[model samples]
Target: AASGSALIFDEEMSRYKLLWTDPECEIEVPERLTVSYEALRTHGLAQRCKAVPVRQATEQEILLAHSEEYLEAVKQTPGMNVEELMAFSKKYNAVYFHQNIYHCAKLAAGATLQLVDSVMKREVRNGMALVRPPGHHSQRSAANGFCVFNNVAFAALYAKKNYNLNRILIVDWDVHHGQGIQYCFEEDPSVLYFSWHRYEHQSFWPNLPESDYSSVGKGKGSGFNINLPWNKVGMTNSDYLAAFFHVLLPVAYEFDPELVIVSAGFDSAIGDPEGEMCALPEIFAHLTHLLMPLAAGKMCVVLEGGYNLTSLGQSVCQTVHSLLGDPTPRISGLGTACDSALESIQNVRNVQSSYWSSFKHLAQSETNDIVWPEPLKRMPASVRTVVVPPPGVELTLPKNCQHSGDISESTAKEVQRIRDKHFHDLTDQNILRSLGNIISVLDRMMRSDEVCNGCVVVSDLSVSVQCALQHALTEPAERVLVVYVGDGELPVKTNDGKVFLVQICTKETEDKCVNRLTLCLREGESLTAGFMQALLGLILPVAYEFNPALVLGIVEETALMRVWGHMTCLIQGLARGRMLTLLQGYDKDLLELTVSALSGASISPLGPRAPKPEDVEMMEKQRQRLQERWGLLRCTVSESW
Candidate 1:
C-alpha cells in the first residue's frame, strides 16, 4: 500500500554500451535502456509511479548466483585496456566490455534484487526494473550475448534466501534463447522456467539443440522447464495467445509460483531486426495483464533484450500502463496461429505431457496437420476502435436514494411491482432498498459520459439481473454484453442479437447460440491462472470482436472473489468503460475493494492458486466448440482438445 507501482532505473545503465562496435554487439546499445525509461516518462506514466533508487550489488549478494572466480574476473574489467577488453569478450559469446562494465553490472543485479525486496516486503504491489547488460543470456561463470551478470537469476536466489520462498516462476519472452537461465535452474524444481524464442532448427543465435522442445529439464526439474521454439518468422498475436493457452499457462497455474519474475525482452515484437515477427506493441499489455494476478500481485520485470528503439519504447510504455492498473490495449491478428507456431505448440505439449496433466492427452504423432480455409479477398470496410479514458478522472457514485420519487416515473412503477412480489420474504428492509439502488446505478451509468463503470451490491441474484437487463434494453443501443459467472439459470429469454449473453458455469446445458454461450468450468479446480487464461485467450478476444455498446455482468455463489475483481477491471475497459457489475452481496469487503481498485483508489492483492488439469481440458473443449461460431476464439493447435 505504500506505492501502487514501482520503477527501478538509474541513468548509470547507459555507461555499458558497445564502445568498440563489433557486428554482433553493435545492436545491443545503451539506448535500449535509456529509450525505454524515456518512453515511460514521455507518456506521463513515470510521475504516477514510485521511483526507487538503484544501488550497486554487494560482494555477498553477487556471490549468490556467481562463483568467486567469476566475481574476481569481472572485478578486473574496470582496469582492462581496449585490447584486453576485446580479448576477454571472446571468451563469452557476443559480449563487449568497457572500463565501467563491472560497476554497471552490479547495479543491474542490485536493482533487480531491490525490486524483489520491495514486492516481498509489500512496499509495492508490482514493479519493473529497466536494467542494462540484459541478464537472461548471462551465465554464472561467463558473460554471453551482451550480458555480464545474471540479474534475474541473482534475484531468484536472493528471494529464496531472504524471503524463504518455496516456488518462483521465471517467464522469458525473448527473441533468442536464454540458455544461461535454463542451465542454472534445469535441475532445480523450486523454480519453473518458461521461454519461447525464435528457433529455426538450430540456425538461430546461440544455436543449441537443447533449445528445442525436447529439453524438459533434468532430474527433479523434468517438467518444470518449458520451451516453445518458433520454427519460422512472421509470428503474430494469435501465435503468442496460442502458446499461453496451450503450453505455458496450464502448467504455470499447476506450479502456482509464489513469485513471478518476467525476463521481458521486446525484441520479439515487430520491427526488430533480430525477430521478424509481426506482433504489435500492445501485445505486451495483454501479456503483462495476464501475469498480474499471480503471487498475490507480487511481480518484478527486468529488462532482457530489445532492439528497434521505436517498438521497444512503445512496448515498454504498454507494459508500464498495465502495471499501473490501466486497461490493456486491444489486440489484433485473431484469425489463428500460423502453421509453424502451431507445430511448435503441439511439439512442446507432446513432450511435456509426462510432466503436466494438461498435456496428457496430446497424441505423440501430431504435427499440426489440420487444414484451415483461406480467407476471402473481400473484407468488410467498417472498422471499430475504442478510445481509452483520460487519466486523473475521479470516480464517484450517485447518492444512495431508494425512493421512487428520485427515479424516472416509468422505472419507479416497474420497480415497485417487483419489490412487492419478490421482496416481501426478505427479512432486512435494506436488501429491498439495495435492489432499488442497483436499478438507479445502472440508469445513471448509461446516462453519464464520464462514468465508465460501476458496481452494485444486492441481496437477490435473479431479481437484480432481471432489473439490470430491463434497464439496458430500454434504449436503442447497438448491443448489450451480458456475462454470467458461476451456476445460475436465466429465466428470461432473448431471441434477438441485441442481448448477447455468455454464461460461464460448471453445470451442463444444451444451448450454444451465436449470441448465447454456456462455458462449463471443471469441478473443484482452482480458478487462478488457468481460468485466467480462458479470460485472456477465449473471452477477451470474443468480447472485443463483438464490440458491445455496454456490458452487464451477473455474479453468483460459485465464483471466486479474486477472479471476479480482475474480471471487472477488464470488462470496464471495454466500450470505453461503460459497465455495470451486479454482485449478490456474498462478501461486502470484496465488493468495496473491487470497486475501489477499479476506480484507481486502492490496490487489490490476488492470492496464489493454480488450475486443475480437468479445468484446462474443459476450457480447451469449450474453445474448440466455440471457435467455429466466434472468429476471435480461433487460435488453437492442430491437436484435438
Candidate 2:
C-alpha cells in the first residue's frame, strides 16, 4: 500500500524493572527492548525506517480492547510506590508493576496504534512496533504472561473504527496463546485471528481449552479464530513452514484481507530461556515473505514475546530486512514436521474447512531439553531478477532487472567448451548464445549476492536443461531442485542427495535414489483439480523438506503460465530466493508473469476453487508413497490415520 517501512521504537526510558525478586517476571528486562532496538541500529535497519515517535494512548483508544476498570487500575500505578505497586500487580495472576510501568505500558499500546495509522494512511508499507510487556497474552481485565496491555488487539479494533476496514487478518506466531485477541474477536467475523502457540496438550501456561485446534471460533466467528497448538516441543523450520502451507495460506488467500497484523514474537525462535522450539531466526524471513503477497503488502508486524537476547535480536532484524523488501536468506535443516504437528494441522483443517471454501481444500513436533545450535548469523542476500532473452526476442521487463548478456569472457569461454550435452547442438552463435542465457544467469546468482534468481528464455529444453543442472552442482551450494512442469523429456538423472527432481506432466512419466518424483495429470476431461493442490499438497512438502540451495523451474508449456508464476513466487521461499526459470519459449505475458513472481508480487489470489476428486486421489497415492521420503509430507503416522 505504501513505499517504506516504519520502525516504532520504545522511547519511554521510564527506568522500569521487575521491582521485585520474582523468577516469573524477572526475564522481561528493559534490555529486551534495548537489545532489539540496538540490533536494528547495529544492522543499520533502524536508520532506513520512517522513525515515528511514540505517544500516550488516549482513554478512548485504550478502551477499544480493555475495560474502564482495568484501565483505571493501571492508571493508578504511576503514582504508587513499590508497596502499592506490588499490591496492585498482585490483583492479577501474571503481572508486575513498577512506578513507571504505567507510562511504558500506555506507550506500548499507543505505538501499535501509531503503526496502524501509518500503514492505513499509506505513509508506510509495513512496520514492526518493537514494544515490551508483550500484548498477545493480556486480556480485557487481566494481565497474563508478561503482557501489560493488549497492544495488537486494540490496534485491530482501532483499524476497524478509524479506517472502516473489513477483513483484517491477525497472525500471532507467538509461542504463547493470545486468548486476549481471540476473545476480543471471537464473535466478530470481519477479523481473522490465526495463532500457533506452544501447547504441550494443555500443559503449557495460559492453558485454556479454547486454545486447542477444535476451538475454531464461536457463532458468526466460527471460522475466524484459528488456533494451531504446538502439541510437541522441538518444532523446526519445516514444521513452521508446513503450518503456513497446509493451514494459514489457503484460508488467508480466501479471506483476502485488507490489512494484516502479525503478533511477531521471537520466543518461539530457538534458544529462548523461558521456552521452546528448534526453529532458527531466519524462518521469520520466509514466513514474512509468504505473507507479503497478501493484502497488497499492507502488513504491520508488532513485537509481542521474545527473550534470549541474541535470538530475539536476530529474529527482529530478519523480520525488518524482509519488510525492507530484501532477498530472503537460504534456510537449511528443513524436512517433515513431527507427527504430533501433523495431528494438530489435520484437526484445525477438519474443523475450519467447514467455514472457508479454500479447503473446497484442505490441509509438528516435540519440546524441551533439546539442544539446538545457535542460528547462523544472517544478512540479506540482496536479490534481483535477471533475464536471458532468446537471441532476437526483445523483452520489456520489471524494475530491478538486468540482462545476462555481459557475463565475463571467461564464463563465455567455459560455456563454449562444456558444449556438455546429452544432445547435439548448433553453432557458437546459436548454442553458445543459448548457453550464455542459462550459465550467466546461474553464474550471477552463484557469484554475487546481488542477483539471487533469474529467468532465461531458451530455444531448446532438453539440451539446455543439462547445462543448468551441471553448472549448479559445482557452485557454492551443495543441492539443486529441478521441478519440470511440461515435458518433451528431462533425461538428466541423479541418484545422490545433491540433486532433487520433481516432474508433473499431463502424460505419465517418471525419483525420490528416491531423490526425484513424477505426479501425472489426467489425460482429458478431468476436473484438472488445478496445479495449486499439487503445488501445495504435493510439490511444496517435498521442496521445503529437500532444502535445495538453488531452485530450477523448467517451464515448457505456455498454457500454465499462471501456474508457472505462482510456482515462481512460492518456491522463492526456498533456496534463499536463488531460483532460475528456463522457459522453453515465452509469451510476452508468460515471461512478464514469471519475473513479477521472481520479484515478489506473489500470484494474485487464485480465488475459491477445489481439487478434482481424482486429483485428490492422485495426491493421496503420491503422498502415501513419498511421505516417508520427504518427512514434511508426513501429515499422519502410519497407524494413526
Candidate 3:
C-alpha cells in the first residue's frame, strides 16, 4: 500500500454494552481502552477523536432488519432461567442475553447506520465503524458470539435493501471462521463472504465440515467461497501482508465490488488468546491502506473479536489513529517479525491466480483513496438551529446565559434596539464624573447609617437637645446641621466608622456665638429614631447580601467609621460565597486579563496591559492571590486559558 488509511474509534461501543448488560458478566474492559476520549485535552491527534452517545433505536427501526419473533425472544430471555438464557443463547446462537438487549441493540444498530450514513453521504472518503460484541458471528435467527444484533451485517443489508446496491463484500479476519456470517450469506451472490481463520485442522468450535478452498457455494454464488485457513500459530505483520498481496488482492480485484465491508477482527494480533496469527497493530493500517483503494474508498470496518487487554487496546488505538490521520508512535521496542512470513505468502498466492485471474492480470496491486474523509458538520449549534453561545462565558466578552430567540422571533432585533438607544450619547468623561460624586456621597452615608442609624437615645444633658434635634429633623437637607447647648454636642460616625461631632451654637448659648456646629447623635425614642436604626441596619445586610463583583466607596464624610462600616458591608457582600473571588476589581489590566479567564460576563477593575502604580501597589492586593494561582500577572485575554 502506497498511502496510509484513516482510523475511527467509536467511544460508544462498549458504553452501549454498559447500558444493556448486568454488571458481573462483563469482562471488565481495561482502563486504557476505556479511557475518556472526550474529557482530556488533545494537543494533536486527540482533536480528530470524537464521541457519539448511543440513543435507543425506535421499534420501527429495529423491525426494518430483525424478525419480530427473534426480537421478542431476546426481550423475554432476560427473565428466563440463567441456564435457560445461556441455552437459548446457544439455540439462538447469540453470545449473551439481557433484558435491555432490545433497547441497547437498537442504539448499536443506529450508530452502525450512522457510520454507513457517512459512507453513503461521502463525508469521509472511507471510514471504519469501531463497534463491539463481534457482529459477524451473529446470524439472523439468533444473537451469537457476544453480539445480540449484527451491527455491520445490518449496515450492509440495509444498504442493499434501501439503495438497490447489489454487490457487497464482507472480509472477516476473526480468529475463528465467521460461520454465522458465512451461513447467513452463503447462498447469496450479491454479498460475497471471504475469511481467513485458524483451521488448525478444524479443531475449533462450530467447525465447518468443509474447510478447503474449493467448498464454493452452489448456483449463482459458486467460486466465491474464498478462505485462507491457517494451520500454524503466531503469524506477524509480514505474514498478513503476504496473504493480502498474494491471495486476497487478486480475488477482490476480480470481484470489483461496488461497496466493500470488512468484519475487522482485532483478535489476530500477537498474544491474543484466541488464534495462532499474531499480527502487529499497524498491520490493520496495512490492510486498510491496501484495500481502501480497490473499492474507490467504499469501505467500512466492523468490530469482530479481540480478547487480550493490552494488545486489544493498543491495536484499536493504532488502527483508529491511522484512520484519524495520526502517525503512530515509534515502533521501537516491539517484537521483531517471525520466519514463517514467506510460507504464509506462498499459501495465499497458490490460490489467488486461478480464482481471480478473469478480472486481473497479475499479483497484488492497489490504488488507495478515501471515500469519506472528514467529520460531518457539527449538528446545527442548537436544536432549532439558533446561534450557539461561545463554549465558555467570561468578562472580556459578554455573551448571554440563555438563548431563547425561538420564543420570540424578533427578540434579537429588540435587543439590538435597546443597546443602540441606551449607548447613544454616552461619553466616558461625563458618565464617570457624575457617578464619582454620587458614589462618594453614597459611600459616606452608607457608613453613618451602619452605626444603628443614629436611632439610639443616649443618657445625657438636655431637653434643649430634643428641641434642637426636632428643628433639624423638620426638613430633608442634603447636609446636616448641629446646634449645641452648654458646650455639649452630638457625635456621628463617619463612613470609616470613626466618631466625630459637628458642634452647634444656639442663640441662648455661647457654644458658637449664635449658630455653633457640633457633632452629636439625636436624643429621642420616637419613630424617627426607629427609622434611623432601620436605615443603618440596611448596611450590614447589603454588605453581606450583594457581595458585589466590584465595590467603590468615597470617604469624604463627617467621621471615618460611618463610611468604613458601609464599605465593610460592601466588602462582606462581595465575599459571601467565596465564589467570585476569581473576580478582581482593581488593576484595570489584571481585570481585563481576568475577564478573559472567566466566561463571558465577569467583573474586574479597568486599565491597559498594566494598571496605575496606586492600583498595583495598594488596591490590587486583595485580588493578587487568584492571579498567581492561574499563572497570570499581566497577560492579554487571548493569551489565557
Candidate 4:
C-alpha cells in the first residue's frame, strides 16, 4: 500500500520503435523490460502512471557531460538511408537516430531525472524509469551503444552536483555490461559502480575485457568498483542472492553512506536475447525486495536492457509486485538448468566471504542453494560443445509412444526446422501454434455459469464455428458458447447479421424428401435432443434481433417434425412478448408443386424463384393494395445483412 512506483514514457518509446527495429534488437534488455511493463497492466498491478514530455537537452546540458565537438558530430545529419541511420546511431554510442530520436532520448532522460528528483526530495520513496533506447551504456563524448545521452549517468551526476550529494551507489544490473557509466566513474571514489553482465570473453557485443571484476579501480577510486561477469546461462535465483548476500550487501553496510540507484535491466531473465543468463521474472522482485530495505527505500531504478517481450513484461510486473511487497507466486514453464551457475555462485561467495567475514553477519548458506533443481541434468561442460540441434531436429518428450497424438514426430521435427530457419520470422499462425496454445489456455480459465447464468464452454479447436465465434467474442461476456458439436441442414441467422446454412448429411442430399428422417445417437449423446437445445439458444437470439412475425421451415433435405418443434420452443422463449407463426407441411418442391397442385383460381402463380429488390418492392405494394380483399398484409425482407 505504501512504497511502490514506476516511471515510463508513452510516445517517447514509440520513437524508439522507429529508431530501433519494430521487431527487436539482438540485445535482451528492451523486450524483457517491455514484457514486465505489459504484465503490470495485464495483471492489474500498476496503480498510477505519469507521462513525461520530451524536451530537448540544451547544448549546455550536453556540455555538462560531453564535449561540444562530440555533441556536434552526433547532431550532424548524414547522407545514409534509414538503415545507415540506425547503424550510425548504434555506432555513435548506440544513439538511436529516427527523426524524433533526439527528442525521445531527452524525454527518456527527463523521466529518469524526474524520478531522481522525486526520490531525492522524498516525494516518492522508490521509483523506476522505463526509457529506451537505453542510456546507461552511452559514454560522455559520443554515443557508444544503442544509448545516446546517458540518462542514468546524467541523473547520477545531476544528483551529485545539483543536490550536492556524494557517495552514491549505482548498480548496473543490465544483462550486458554497463560500460559507459563505469567508464566515466571508474576513477571517482565519490561514486560506487557495480555491475553484473554476460561476459563470454568477447563473444558477446560491446566487449570490454578490461572491465572484469579484478580490474577494480585505480588512484582515488581503488576497490570501489565491482563487477560480476556471468559466463553462461541458467543463472538462477540463488546465484543472484549469492552476489548480493556475499558481496553487494557486505560492502553496502561497510560503506554505509548513500542513495542507491538500480540500473534495472530485465534482460537478465532466462529468455533475454543478448544474455544467455537464466533468471526468472520473480528474480527481479526478489532483487528489489533485498535492496528496498537497505536504502530505506531510497532508490531510483532506470530501465537498462531487456529484449524479450513476454519475459520483459513479466519481469517488470514482478519487480513492481515486489516493490509493493506483494507475494509473487513462483514462475515455472521455462525448462532450463542452473547447475553451472552453482559454480559461479560459489566463486562469488568464496571471493566475497573474505571481505565480509570480518563484519557481524549470519553464517553463510551453501552456494549450491543458488542453483535450482533442474529437470535436465548439468549443462554441457562447454558452451560450444553442447550439441546444437541440426537444422531440422527438436528435442521432444521421451520417444516411445502408443496411439499417435494429434501432432506426429515428423511434424515436430518440421516445426523445429522452421524455428531454425525463421527463428523470429515464423509469423504464420499454424507455424506459431504454440503461441496460439497460450491464448487457448488463458481462454480456458474463463468461466460463466457460476452465478447460475450461462454455461462455460472451453474452445473447441476441431470445430470451425467455435473457432470463428471465439475470435469474434474475446471480450467479457454474459453468455458464451465454449464448444460446438455437429451440423445440420438448416439456414439459421444470428442477431449479429451472420447467416449459417446447415445441411444435414444424407445419402441423396441434392434432392427433396417427404419422409421425416432421424439420426440415431450413442448412449449419452442424442442427435436430436442435444441439437434442439443448442439451436433454441441460437434461434432465440435471432428472433429477438429480427422481430420476425413468422418462422418458415423448408426442408430440401429430409427432416422429422421434431427439429421444427424445438425451433418453435426456442423462439418462444426468447420472444416471450411477441407472436410467432409457424409455416410448415409444404411439399419438398412446394413452390413448383403448389402451382401445379392449386386449382385454376385459388392461387395466382408467383413469377420467379428469387425476386430482385425492385420486383419485391412492386410485389409488396401490390399486396398492400389488395390487403382489404385478403384481410391481411405482410412485410418481407431478405435474411442477409
Candidate 5:
C-alpha cells in the first residue's frame, strides 16, 4: 500500500447548478464542494498529501453502469434551455439541471474513478473526492436525489472490469437510503454494499420496501446487501458507532475486500436538515479510522449528500484528517446503543444473519412466542425501555435486611456448609430473600436426576443473578452455560472455561468478551420470522455444542418479555429440557405456566411463522461461525440444527 492520501478534486465540477425553483434540489449546491475543499485548505490538509486532478468520464465509462439511452439523454442536457432542463429534471426525483450539469456529472463520475485508480496503482494509500450532483441515489436509466450519474456504481463496475478485482465494498453513511446503489448490485455477489440511512419506517424520502433490512439481496447476491435502517431520526454518534461495531465492521472484515469505497455523505451529521442527526464532525474521523485497517489501508471517500455546510465542511475535514493518518478524536456516549438504533441493528442482524458466515453465530433461536403485529407496520418505541425494571416492582429483602446476624446460627451453619461444598446458599447480606429462594430451587434441581430444568422468578434482578451463578458453579457441575438476554451490569469475569457466560443483548458491552453475542433485538417490537431462525440456527446450536451439564437463562424485564416463553422452549431443548430460567418480576402462576409450555406440559402460541430473508441470512451467518466448534449443529447432509 502507498504511504500518503490523494485529493481528487477540480474547480470545473462546481459549474453544475439547479436552474429551477424546487426545494429539494437547492441545498445540493456547488458550494457543497467548494466549502469542503476550503476546509481542507484552511487546515493545510490539502498540502500534506498527493493531489490528483479530476477528468471527465468517457461515454464508455459512464456506460459501465448506465444504459446507452441514459447516456445519450444526459449528453443532450447541455443543449436544453432552462424550461427544457426543468422538464428533464421532472423525469427524476429530487433532481434539477442546467446546461452545465451534463459535463459536471461526467466529471463527478470521473473524479471517483480517478481516485480509485490512484489507490489501486499505489499512487496513494487512500483519497477523497469532492464532487457535486452525488451519484449514490441515481440509477442506470433515471436521475434521482440530485444525482445525475451513478459515480460509485460506475467506479465499482469499472474496478471489476478494468482491474479484474474480485471483491469491492461500498459503505454509504447517508441519512437517506440509497436505493440506486442497492438496486444496481442487489443481485450481484461480487460487491458487498452497506448503507445506514434514515428510513423512519418508510415515512422518509424514496419510501420503498426495497430499502428495508428485509431486502438482503436477490438470488446469488443474497446477504451481500446490508442496510441499517434508522426507523426514527435524531440519531447520535453512539448510534452510528453502534451500527459500525455490531453490523458493518463485522461483515466487512469477513468479506475482506480488495478495495473500500465510502459513499461519504455528511447529511447524516448534526445540523444537517436532511439527516436531523446529532452526530458531531468527529464521528467521520472514527468511521474512517475503522476502515483504515482493511484492504491494507486502501479506501476512497467520495462526497454524497451533505446539505448542512458547517457540518459538511467540518466532517469533510475530519475524514480527510483521519485519511491523512491523524489520530481519531475520542468519542462519547458509547456505553449503550440508543433505543431506536438498537432496534434497527437487531432488525438488520436478524434479516442478514442467514447468508453470511459473519452473521452465522447470530442467527435465530429455536422458538419465539412474540406476538407480532401486521408485517409492514411500525412497532412502538416505548417497548425499548421495558428492559429496565419498573419502580413499582417491590424488592424482597431479608427480614433482618442489612446483616447475616438475623439468621439463626443453625441456618448460618448450613449456608456455610453449602458454600464450603462450592454449592451456594445465599445467607449473605447482599443476597435478597426472593433471590435466595430461587437459588435454593436451582440447587435442588442440580442434585435431583428428575429435575434437569426449572424456572426461577424473582423480584430483585441484580442479587438473584449473582445467587443463581454461585449455585450453578457448585463443584459437582463441571461446566455451565449461562445465556443472559437483555441489558444490565454483567458480573465480574472468569475465563477458566468452567463457567461459560454468553450475554445476548442490544448494546455493546464496555469490555469485549469472546463468548458474548450482542443481538439488538428491539423492545416493544414484534419478532419477525427471522427471530426464530436466529434462535434455532445460532443460540441453540452453540448451546448444544457446548454440551454443558446445566443451561441457565437470565432474562431482563423488557418489552421482549413476550419472547420469554419462546426462549424457554429452545433453552430446554439444549439440555433435553435440562435448563433453568431466572426472570425479573412476574406472577408465580404465570411464570409456571410459561415454564410448563416449555416443558411440553402445555401449548404456547408462537410468534410470526415465517422468517424474512434478513433473519434467514443472519441465522446462516451464526451457524457458519459456529459449525467448526459444534459439529452436532449440522447433519451429515449439512443441514443446520
Candidate 6:
C-alpha cells in the first residue's frame, strides 16, 4: 500500500563513544552513524525519502528481546560515574558503558521499530535506519561485540506479535555472526533468519561452533535458520552472489515471508577492517533489488557494523539508491566463489535441502589473496524506460518514462545502412519504417545519457536484432550481450569478442566457446517455477562474468512468456541498465509485462521451484564445460576458470 521509502535517523544517537581505551571496542565510534547519514544527505538520497522521527524505546519495547533484570541493570548505567562505568562495562566482552549509552541504546532500538512500524502500517514500502551501538551481537542479558540492546531481534518479535505475521524473514549480511538474533529465533518457526558471516573456521571473533552451517536450528525451527560461514577471508562479490543463488534465495522464495528485514552491515564491503572481504559497495544495489521482488516489496534495513568510513558511506548510499528504485550499477570483476566459500555454500545447501524442495537437485577449501578493481560509479540515466509501441496498440504508459514517437533522420539513415548490408528482405517501406523506428529508439538509448532502456515491437525480430546488433557494435566500448529466448534465427555470429550470444531454447548444443552458449531446456509452467537454479547458476554468472557494455534481449512471442517481467528486471542490472527488447510478434500481455520491467517496477514474489533432474544435469554439464572459462560459475577451488 505504501509507495515510497522511509528514512530513520537522528543526531542524538551519535553522542556516545568509548570513554576507556579498549582495543576491541575502539571501532564503535559515533562517527560511524554520522558518516552514513551524512553520505545519504550529501547524495540528496536522504531528502528523497519520507523522514520518520526517532524516539526512545519504552521499557516494554526493550523487553521484547531483552530481559527485565537486564533492562534494570542497563538503566543503572546512566547514573554510574566514569570509574563506575568502566567497572560496570567489565561484565560484557568487547562492550563499553556510558551515561549517554543507555539513552542512545534505547534510541537505536526505537529507530529499528520505527522502520518496522512505517513498513507494516503502510506509511512506507521499505526503509533503512542508521543506528549506533549495533545490536546484532547483543545477547538476551549480555552485551557483546560492542552491542547493547538488540535492535533487529526485538523488531522481528515486535512485528510478529503486533501484526500477527505468520512468516517473517531476517537477512543478516553483516560480516560477523548475529548469534544473539539467532538465539532469539532459533526455536521459533515463524521467523526465518539467514546470516552469512566471516567465520575463518571458528578462529574469528565471538568464535562459536554453532555459527557453522550445520547449526540449522533447534527442534521445530530446524531449517529456519540458515548460515553460510566464510571459512576464509578475501571473499569477492561473485562469492556472495553465488551463496544467494545456491543457498539463501531458493529457500527464501519458498518461505515467502510477509515482511523482510535486513541486518545490513557495511563491514562486509570492500576495505573494511573487520570484514577483510572484497565485495564492492555497488553490489549492495543488486542485493537490495533482488529482495525487492519478495514480501510485496516490504523490507527494512537496520544498520549493524562498519569501521571503514569511506566504504561504509558509499555502501549506505548504494543501499538507499536501490531502495529509491534506481537502476542497479553493473558489478565489475565478478568471478567464481572460491573453494572455501563454495564449501560453505554446498554445506548449507545440503543442510537445508531436507526441508526445502528447491534444493532437491543439489550440488570447495582454499582462500587466495584476490584483488578486485574499484567499482565504477553508478551513473543512472535521467529516464529509465522508453517505449516505442506500434500503432493501434492500446496500453497505459508508465510514469517517469519517455515515449518514442517519430524516427530521427540520422537513426533512419543508420537503419538504411543496416538494411542494405544485412536484411535485403526488409525492402517494404512499411517494414522499413517500423524497423527505422525501432533503431531510432535504440539509437537514442545508446547515444544519449538520458534514456536507460527501451521496449519495442518489430515486424521481424530476427531481422531487427541483426540490425540492432550491427548498430550496437559501433558504440564506445561496445561488447553486446544477446539473450535469445527461443529457437529462432540468430542473425549475429559469436566468437568476434564484440557480441556475446547466449541462446536459451528447447534444443541442446555441445558447442563450447567463450563468446557463445546454448542453454537448452523445455519451457512450460511446471518447469518455469523450477528455473531458479538455471537462471542464477548459469545465465547470471555467465553474463556477469562477461561484463557486457550492453544487454540485448531477443524474445519470441511465446518464449519465457510468464516470467519475462522478472527476467527483464534482472538483466537490467547489467550494463548500467542499458537494454533493448524487440519482440517478434505482438502480444499485449507480454508487451505490458516487458514495459513494466523496463520501467523499473518490482515484480511479485517468485514461487519456490527447483530445476528438474535432467535440467540440473544439463546445467551441470554446461557448467563443467564452461566454468573453466567463466570463473563465476565454478563451484570448486581450482582457479583456472
Residue-by-residue lDDT tens digits, candidate 5, 1-641: 25678998888888877766787767888888899889888888888868898899998898888899988888898898998888888887788888998888988999999999999998887899889879998998999988888989988998899899888999999888888899999999989999998988988898988888898989999999998888888787667766775678667756767889999999998889888887888778768866765666679898998988778888888888768654334343333455677778777877776876545545546422111111111111111101111224443321211111133444446455545564355455433444444454554455544334455555656656655676567535666778777676656344776666666666544434435444544333334334544554456445544656667677676724444555554454333344667666665544554554333331233312343444444445554555454442331123337
Candidate 1 lDDT: 0.73
Quote each prediction's TM-score. Answer: 0.81, 0.91, 0.48, 0.51, 0.60, 0.94
Each candidate: what lDDT? 0.73, 0.79, 0.43, 0.47, 0.68, 0.82
**Tens digit of per-residue lDDT, candidate 2, span 1-641:** 25789999865732588888878887888898899999999888899899998888899988888889988888888889889988888887777888887788888888899999998898987888988767888888888777878999988899999899888999999888989999989999999999999889999988789999988888998899899999888788888988988888877876878889999988899988655788888889888988887776789899988888888988998999889877777776677777888888878877776786545444301100334454444444455888877666777765667666776778877776786443345564665677777887788888887787888877767668888888888775688889887755585666667888888777664433467677776654433334666777778878887888899888785434445666777788788788898877756787888887787653564434555555666666777778777877765545745
Weakest ten-residue segment in model 4 by summed lDDT? 378-387
> What CA RMSD would you report for each candidate?
7.7, 4.0, 30.4, 30.8, 18.9, 3.3
TM-score computed on alpha carbons, candidate 1:
0.81
Q: Model 3: per-residue lDDT, tens digit, 376-457?
A: 1111011110111212222232231112112232433433343356445434432222222222222222322211111111
**Model 1 alpha-carbon miss at residue 167, Å:** 0.8
State the number of backbone clashes in model 2: 15
lDDT of 6: 0.82
User: Which ten residues in a row are the worst by lDDT in model 1?
Assistant: 378-387
Between candidates 2 and 5, the TM-score winner? 2
**Number of clashing pairs, model 6?**
2
- What is candidate 1's lDDT per residue for 200-276, written digit by digit as tens? 99899889999999999999889888999988988887788667766776676567788999999999988898988
Model 3 residue 134 CA deviation in Å: 2.4
Q: What order do candidates take by lDDT, descending?
A: 6, 2, 1, 5, 4, 3
Q: Which is superior by lDDT, 5 or 6?
A: 6
Q: Could you tell me how far off, in angstroms, the CA of residue 350 lies in candidate 1 after the best superposition?
A: 2.4
Candidate 3: stretches off by over 4 Å: 1-46, 49-66, 78-87, 90-94, 326-355, 358-641
- lDDT by residue for model 4 (369-416), tens: 123332211110111001111122333311111111133454456445
